[PDB]
Amino acid sequence: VLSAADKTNVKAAWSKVGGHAGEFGAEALERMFLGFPTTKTYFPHFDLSHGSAQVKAHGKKVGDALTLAVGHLDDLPGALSDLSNLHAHKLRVDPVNFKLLSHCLLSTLAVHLPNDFTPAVHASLDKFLSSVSTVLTSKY
Amino acid sequence: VLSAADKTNVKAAWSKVGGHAGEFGAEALERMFLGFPTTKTYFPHFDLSHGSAQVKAHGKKVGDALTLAVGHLDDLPGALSDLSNLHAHKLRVDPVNFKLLSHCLLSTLAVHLPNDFTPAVHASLDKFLSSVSTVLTSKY
Amino acid sequence: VQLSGEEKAAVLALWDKVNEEEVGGEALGRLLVVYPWTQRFFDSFGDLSNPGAVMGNPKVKAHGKKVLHSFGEGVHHLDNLKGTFAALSELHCDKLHVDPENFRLLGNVLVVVLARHFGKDFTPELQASYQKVVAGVANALAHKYH
Amino acid sequence: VQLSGEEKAAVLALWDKVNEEEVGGEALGRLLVVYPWTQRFFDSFGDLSNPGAVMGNPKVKAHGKKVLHSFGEGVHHLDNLKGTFAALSELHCDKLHVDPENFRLLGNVLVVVLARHFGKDFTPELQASYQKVVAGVANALAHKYH
Ligand code: HEM
Ligand code: HEM
Ligand code: HEM
Ligand code: HEM
């Protein structure tokens, strides 16, 4: 679970991401596709080349969903209900892959916000991404 | 999360365990110590030989806590709050070890209740033990 | 990998009693029911929606038999698991894209199934040996990913 | 294990710029903060209760330097990771009882730290090579458990 202190950290850190959430989401996906090539299997319909428009558009949707989650930390199951259905029932994403994207998102935040990516902030964001991952795999 | 159908299955299956919960808990621990020798590190103070009284007593406490949980499926965080503190703050149990004990408990139930350990029941018990494990590691 | 002579003999003696079709069919079926994301790899098998459909599906039984037969080859070649599974490791990585975590999941399901079939004969000591076997197989299948 | 010549050169070129003390100290400190159960192995280091205590602890910095130095030995011997880490694999299994999942956790923390230190120079392609290195090291440290 997220403590009050973790919630404060997550909201603070995401305020520093601000308008870059979609660009970070896109870079995190690129890092994941290159680092962990088994994840490419879920995107047969995408052009996965560097700076692909479909990767940029998908990164935007991922970034916006994380922004939504940061607004709904007291009710993630409610806010992300429709995404839980999509990832479990339709897409059947292996739960391992959420760990991989989480790692790639932390890596991307480290690149762009090195002064703000403190140990305490890293810890809170890790818990946040785990809580999001738990919700998105909850309907198995 | 546990659906209504999973809750029904778990309560039904545990009614068949009945008075054997403590003996199953003890055997699951023995299976875990032999199968996964890194888990022995947490019990320096125990005699871990076959039919050790301390293993039998600890198996009883584990079995009783699972029985408690089966009674409180709508509020596991509340019922197991004190155990969450013990496993996270004092004992610092690596989360990996809950998976190992869960497996050993399923193995033990398979041994003793082969006709009752159906695929649907296996699925519900796995989710139950995961939910218990999540609560016991929640205070990290 | 690391078994005593006496452990090795107990492992092989149990394998003599394994019906590869019944155990295989059950192991694969239980994987698909318990870990439902694994169903993504078997869309060609048809209806895997509910437990009844999975356990009675003839393609599930036949595939489970194949898998278990291959496991059996490993049980008879414990000194050369990497050699026995090299071709299958390539298939699983390059052609099927199975995350290796799923090999460990199937290995553990198989142990649960052996427990169910053998009861009190599947002692804590015998389980411990089987855990070394299933981890040995899982590692050999993972070999050509990293 | 499986790197091209050009990937290998990029990995080694970055390692030339790694301060083992600053990166090591940070990597171990972050592991202890983010994954607090890992603190069980380091009770002899004293107060690891809060983030401030961990990151300033001199035993954390010194140990992190040791760990990173050893990682560096791996980076310079990518063709023989099992040989380089055999003695340490024994120590971690037989003497320390570290679950191998924790090697993968530390490897990923190290990648996050490299990202933080190198910024846009730690490209997606360079990260991908580092992921193969850290998985190679983790596997070599795990070798003498199974
Ligand atoms: C924090 C983690 C994740 C978030 C917040 C997230 C969010 C989303 C969103 C918002 C959508 C679009 C839904 C729509 O347009 O209706 C989506 C679709 C999808 N996601 Fe996820 N996702 C996550 C993780 C993953 C992972 C780990 C995978 C697989 C490796 C994945 C695979 C997909 C696929 C294949 C689609 C459909 C894309 C398309 O067809 O256009 N997702 N996700
Ligand atoms: C379903 C999982 C688990 C349950 C329900 C559970 C439950 C309990 C209970 C009820 C106690 C005794 C508390 C008391 O007397 O105050 C306890 C203690 C303890 N548990 Fe857990 N436990 C679980 C998993 C684990 C695992 C995975 C480990 C480590 C491998 C572990 C290690 C311990 C230790 C070392 C103690 C203290 C024993 C003593 O000193 O006497 N537990 N647990
Ligand atoms: C102990 C673990 C495993 C063993 C020994 C094993 C063995 C095999 C064997 C012998 C085949 C047949 C190859 C052929 O016909 O040449 C195969 C195919 C296959 N395996 Fe695995 N397997 C393992 C784990 C898994 C897991 C966990 C999954 C999925 C989650 C998987 C998915 C498949 C699929 C989709 C095929 C192709 C089926 C087809 O063509 O009809 N396997 N495996
Ligand atoms: C890439 C991964 C790792 C590498 C390269 C590594 C390397 C080392 C090295 C070089 C030593 C010193 C041995 C000596 O003085 O002879 C050591 C000791 C130690 N390592 Fe690891 N290590 C790794 C991961 C871990 C992890 C994840 C943990 C714990 C969660 C751990 C816990 C320890 C402990 C407790 C010691 C003994 C410290 C002492 O005596 O003061 N190591 N490791």
Residue numbers in the entry:
A (entry chain A), B (entry chain A): 1 to 140
C (entry chain B), D (entry chain B): 1 to 146
From the paper:
Hemoglobin (Hb) is an iron-containing heme protein that is essential for oxygen transport. The protein is an assembly of four globular subunits, each containing a heme B (protoporphyrin IX group; Hsia, 1998). Equine hemoglobin was among the first protein structure to be solved at high resolution.
We have developed a fixed-target method that ‘sandwiches’ oxygen-sensitive crystals in between silicon nitride (SiN) chips, protecting them from ambient oxygen. Using crystals of DeoxyHb, we demonstrate the practicality of this design for anaerobic SSX, and further verify using UV–Vis and X-ray spectroscopy that the hemoglobin crystals remain in the deoxy state. The most noticeable movement is at the β-heme, where a water molecule is bound in MetHb compared with the empty β-heme in DeoxyHb. To establish the consistency of the method, crystallographic data were collected from a total of five chips, and all four chips that gave sufficiently complete data exhibited the presence of the deoxy state. All five chips with DeoxyHb that were also independently processed exhibited the presence of the deoxy state, with the exception of chip 3 that contained a bubble following the preparation, resulting in too few indexed images for a separate analysis. The doses of the first XANES scan and of the crystallographic measurements were similar (70 and 40 kGy, respectively), and both showed the presence of the deoxy form. As demonstrated by a combination of XANES, UV–Vis absorption spectroscopy and X-ray crystallography experiments, the described method slows down reoxidation of the hemoglobin to a level that allows data collection within a reasonable time frame for oxygen-sensitive samples. The XANES data showed that the hemoglobin crystals stayed in the deoxy form for at least 40 min. The β-heme of MetHb moves downwards to the proximal side of the heme pocket. Both structures are in agreement with published structures.
